[PDB]
Symmetry: D2
């Protein structure tokens, strides 16, 4: 038999046990296949189905599990079934079975459930962002580029900017599932079943949308796994951007947010210090999921057709990525929802460094003023204001008129932070009216995606 080293290397039960319910489902399906093929009596069919039901119970309550001598989840469950119905009846399921189309089938069935648990977690983070945005619809903050202050924006606009990538990831999940929903069952070892079974019927029975077009491709290809790994990596990277904002916002130097005691760690002695651990772990684990993706693609690279044992490595990186997101998504959702925003802090910084001189120039350009001239006017305003040690808004009607006759008192409309943001009122802009329309569209987009994922 196999050497100890071979058996230890090829054993998959430490990770594949999560496929057990799907294996049992496939076995139930296969019992029907054999019945339709006249290869099982009704007595045998019913006996096999009873045994499988009993096995499913024992797997579910943990009274049945793998032994060290089981190579994989399928072998464990075959042993379990034989223990329950005897070797004669139990062994009858081996007819018309293959191990290559089965393993591909189970991974897809698992993945289509997995991607929807992830999707539900993503919708929860989108929900938490939308909820904070609706709760703070008028808070103004500095808009950052290069982590430096540029144009004032609504906090709500910044928060929702983290929802749109996740909505795109949900869209990626929907697109992915169509590809995932093709059944390889009936493709056999590589060349197609010779049993005369019906791939289309089996596919429907197992919850797939269709059966495969080419048995060799159905059993050999794993681009569905690579794609899922990419979507999971993308989601993780998108969380890491949100995470980076929160980590920086949380610093006492920024002080934009206060973390909740239950969604952070804290000091034994320093009373008010809280650490953004959840965000940090999101940040760190995004690198992990990138690695899972890169490594799976390298595993798939230069595979000759058809099935090779390399392909056993398809599952663990994807299993890992899903398990990480299942932990990260509820943790990030709660972190976001429990944030306290320090609105005076953010608003105070928003007009600093004469950033509103940009708005002044843009206003001038809108009046028909040449851009260079506008710029010069803005510079004059900045220098004039700096001399008196006041903000631009505190410049007198005479001082403004002095700099340029185009600088009418009406320019003060964009020399407040409210006035600044309100002027940015095109689609996608940070003006309150647009952000309100953006927020409603997010609610509808999310609901539409959610319903697309209903099977």
């Amino acid at each position: 038999g196999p050497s100890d080293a071979l058996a230890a290397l090829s054993k998959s039960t430490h990770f594949d046990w999560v496929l057990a319910p799907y294996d049992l489902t496939a076995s139930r399906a296969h019992t029907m296949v054999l019945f339709r093929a006249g290869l099982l009596t009704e007595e045998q069919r019913d006996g096999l189905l009873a045994g499988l039901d009993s096995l499913a119970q024992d797997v579910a309550d943990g009274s049945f599990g793998p032994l060290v001598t089981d190579e994989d989840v399928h072998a464990a469950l075959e042993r379990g079934l034989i223990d329950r119905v005897g070797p004669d009846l139990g062994g009858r399921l081996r007819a018309g079975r293959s191990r290559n189309d089965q393993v591909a089938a189970l991974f897809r069935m698992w993945l289509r459930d997995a991607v929807r648990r992830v999707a539900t977690g993503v919708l929860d983070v989108v929900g938490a962002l939308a909820e904070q945005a609706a709760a703070h619809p008028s808070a103004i903050m500095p808009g950052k580029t290069h982590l430096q202050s540029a144009q004032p924006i609504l906090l709500a606009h910044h928060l929702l900017a983290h929802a749109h990538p996740l909505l795109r990831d949900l869209d990626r999940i929907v697109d992915f599932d169509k590809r995932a929903a093709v059944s390889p069952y009936g493709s056999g070892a590589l060349a197609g079943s010779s049993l005369g079974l019906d791939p289309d019927a089996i596919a429907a029975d197992l919850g797939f949308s269709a059966a495969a077009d080419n048995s060799v491709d159905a059993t050999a290809a794993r681009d569905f796994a690579a794609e899922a790994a990419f979507v999971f990596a993308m989601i993780a990277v998108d969380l890491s951007r949100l995470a980076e904002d929160i980590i920086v916002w949380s610093s006492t130097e920024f002080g934009y947010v206060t973390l909740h005691d239950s969604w952070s760690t804290g000091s034994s002695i320093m009373p008010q210090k809280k650490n953004p651990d959840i965000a940090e772990l999101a940040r760190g684990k995004s690198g992990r999921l990138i690695g899972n993706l890169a490594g799976l693609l390298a595993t798939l690279k230069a595979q000759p057709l058809a099935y090779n044992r390399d392909l056993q490595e398809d599952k663990e990186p994807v299993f890992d990525s899903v398990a990480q997101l299942e932990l990260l998504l509820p943790a990030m959702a709660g972190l976001v929802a429990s944030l306290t925003f320090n609105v005076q802090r953010m608003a105070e910084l928003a007009p600093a460094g004469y950033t509103l001189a940009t708005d002044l120039a843009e206003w001038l350009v809108r009046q028909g003023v040449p851009f260079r001239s506008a710029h010069e006017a803005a510079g004059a305003a900045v220098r004039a204001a700096e001399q008196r040690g006041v903000g631009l808004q505190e410049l007198t009607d005479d001082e403004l008129a002095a700099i340029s006759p185009e600088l009418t008192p009406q320019v003060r409309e964009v020399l407040t932070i409210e006035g600044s943001v309100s002027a940015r009122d095109c689609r996608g802009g940070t003006a309150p009216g647009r952000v309100a329309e953006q927020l409603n569209a997010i609610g509808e987009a999310a609901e539409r995606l959610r319903r697309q994922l209903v099977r």
Copy 2:
């Protein structure tokens, strides 16, 4: 100004010159924005458009190019426009423009063209595979698993198993393009234009399907780039599988194919010796493109909002992945199309090592024979035929009966390679009838995907 070290680091003209036509298109669109805003006269507008067409022609024929002092393609083209219409009229274009929404828009426009040049190449490889499959409808070869002979399959079936993944890649391009087709123009530096422009109209004019929902996300996010890099990596990996097959097929030990003089390297000395360099470069370059993807995700990880100079690193790995595929796809297409298949060699190998013993057992199982018993029967036939040193087909009826009474002479239906493949006649199977249907659907699917990419 900038130190030499800073200027050298941030200079992008060595790769961004391919954006020049898109930058000119954007500038034409912005001339219209400004005219709609009443910020340009009809004379000024016509002067700018005419000057842009002068500059465009001088870019197209290489008259106009960047200088060492130019930092980026936009600055170069602004210099060019100013040379052509004077600084007074030229400078008027600066009104209402931002860099950050512009650079995101240009990359998307370039990418929607690039992904279509890639798609055309992909369709050519699919076509070369279809071409070789159609030319050899009845040739049978060994079906490999673990690079060991299993069930005989049609050569066409194997070839087409490399076409289905590519069709899926095409499907991925179609899905990606919908996300790519969203315009950031009008989002400004991050907060949205204050000019009063119409992002939906600018979008239409630039060839986008829609404008962005959030100015911060539109200027900061680059998941569209990561998704393109994933699709390119996946295409490359799929080519590396086809490449690996051809390299093994080409070895003198296999001798499944003879390479074409014009699509391989060889020596004058030994005329028959040909090397599959194109397939080897495909294999090697798939690694490169996995790297581009992994690296781009790592670049995007933990970016705080909004625009950071980090994001300048979005283009070069995607430009690299596209340029590589643009070399690889016609190379692989021609390599595949010009192959000589040695069908007698492949047919002779297909039934080696009594592989048809599997078909024998499967036949017995179809007859109602228990699996264990069928396998015993299969073992017996191999031994029985091995003892006489003949193929299984050559066993007499009496002998076949001796091994088992269930083994009627009818079992001979599957004891030739033609009868073996013929029995695998479910959807996706290698039977000539299914394969012809498969091949028909591939041509239709390819064309449907092609129409979906017409803009």
Copy 3:
């Protein structure tokens, strides 16, 4: 208290239990630190050390394990220690302890043991290659370039070509360990201990070679972990090259090797067919380990100083790469040792396709013949022999002289594979004499590395 989602995300006991013995060692060392600091009596010291000995024994035999409520291995062992010596004495260990320098220390300690287990496995694969080379000192095979036959080479030369990379990997482990062998203990949370302890003393105690130069870098940096991940990935890639050769050699088309029943998979039916699963799993897992490395660098990227929670992600990729290599190296070693080389098959193929014409041409060059003429002479020789349907060796003295007067009957020195390989007698060449020296030197180099890796 922590939310359920926070507790679930931050819990590390599902992977960090392997650190338990190292944690206990650290506790013993810290008992000595506290006693030196005059903070423990001799009784308190002996009491603690006795409790830690109790705890170690219970950990070692499985009677003590983590609970669901334990966040990490250190908390579990603190619980266990208090259970054994009561809270009053057990709580006294907490004095002068910090988490961050400890977790860094433990990982390093574990990694220096782990890398030596990996090194022993690498030496076993090297030994198995050397042993197969020693058993077949004169077997000649085709030398492959592009998977095409080029110069004949000794099978031993090919086999040893897979040992040199692994020796380089061992050399990388030695170089890595000097960096690994620096203790962070006493660096505290980040700024260094204020207890007045002696990091150099503690370092020696814990098995390190030196103590760190900077408390901030000692607690924050993880480049030692990235470097280990690289070396493990390099080892995996080197194994994948060997794997690829064995997979191809194993094909029935090559028939260079026959697999062993205990080191392959197969079927009872066709006893002869065997699959190289071990090599295929090695190929697949190399992708996985490349992923682990890429992801870990992505995790370490753009970390601000000092410790961040992101750093918790340092272990799992490295643990996974080590666990995989500890399965792979004995499997590959046993796979190599079990191979049966079909030397007659390889010898028959070595001179095919008139490859010895190259040797002919080169011999002419050695005689002073101009390059291009030497080549047409060789091409002439081939076609002359092509005509007669014989080998270059069978060309009569007249035919040789006919082709060229320089082609004396002595040329036949290189027109046998034996004479061909014998001419390649410079350092590193495939001549029997050179390879025997190469093989002797490999044993010496392996022994030198082995010794460097014992402490």
Copy 4:
């Protein structure tokens, strides 16, 4: 002849031209090899060297360059040589020459120069960190963990914490070089030369430390390139950490540093705003270089021996990584050197949030106080101070005694930031006396490493 698609794919002159001087050097070396072998007269020899000298001049001044029809740098220089000495004398150099050992040799030669250009740049960054640390010996800042304030540390300690990883990288370069300095010249196509040349002599001639042990390994393996990719990635990741700090330090919220106008970008409008573009590009390109490494390992994975065209792909990712670092290192050195540290700001922040209560508790523990007693005492002192709205040092002797008899007035020696950091006086700690020793040791280590890289 080769199709256009084949020629376009295999062409390498767009990146390989940097190998021109190394190729010329090898050609001189080979001219000697042939002379020693008596295959060149002195007239032919001196005629060749004269031609190669002319060619070297023309290459160095741009007068000679590749044509579109040249496949590679070697073919171009060969063409150029024939132009200068005529096809007869020129064509004699091809005797005893192989492509496979040559391309591995030139890459190695290039790489050993390149890694030293990189090392010098790394030493420049180390130098800039060290000079800033020397310039600011008494500045105390918040020590960060989780980007939250913990123990106070010297600014010099923090800055030097970015030097040590770089020193480790320099050490990695030294170790890598030993593996790099092995010559493949003489290994021929794969089996070793039959010319009788002397590999040890050629190696020493070309600047290598030794010649290879196995011709197959010397021509096929590329782990040396993988290792360089790793060292370059690790350097980039280490710069990305320094970069992140600078970016965050530069935010107006932190205000720890002010960037220099020549080493940052500014705003035409906001007079004081400066963006950390150099740091941001360093962060972004670190992702790029991780990708290069991952991709190269993926390229090397599962290569059968020996040379395969795959291996052409070895150069561009390494070339790219070097080219990026050669831009980044002087940019980051000058960035660091020109920073202005705002020392009042950092000092004001360092003792915030009652962080010195940790120091309080630790001081108690040093006085034999039970760990829990120390911690609730410190917590009490915080509460006491917090209600008087004062700092811990402002507690009276009587209030301290109230909280605990152990809190004698001497506890005040750690209730200033200077006294806090002064207490951390073990090796590697942030006390001024330790940091001074650390800083001196960095100077010695830097110089030692530089000497080791001198060839």
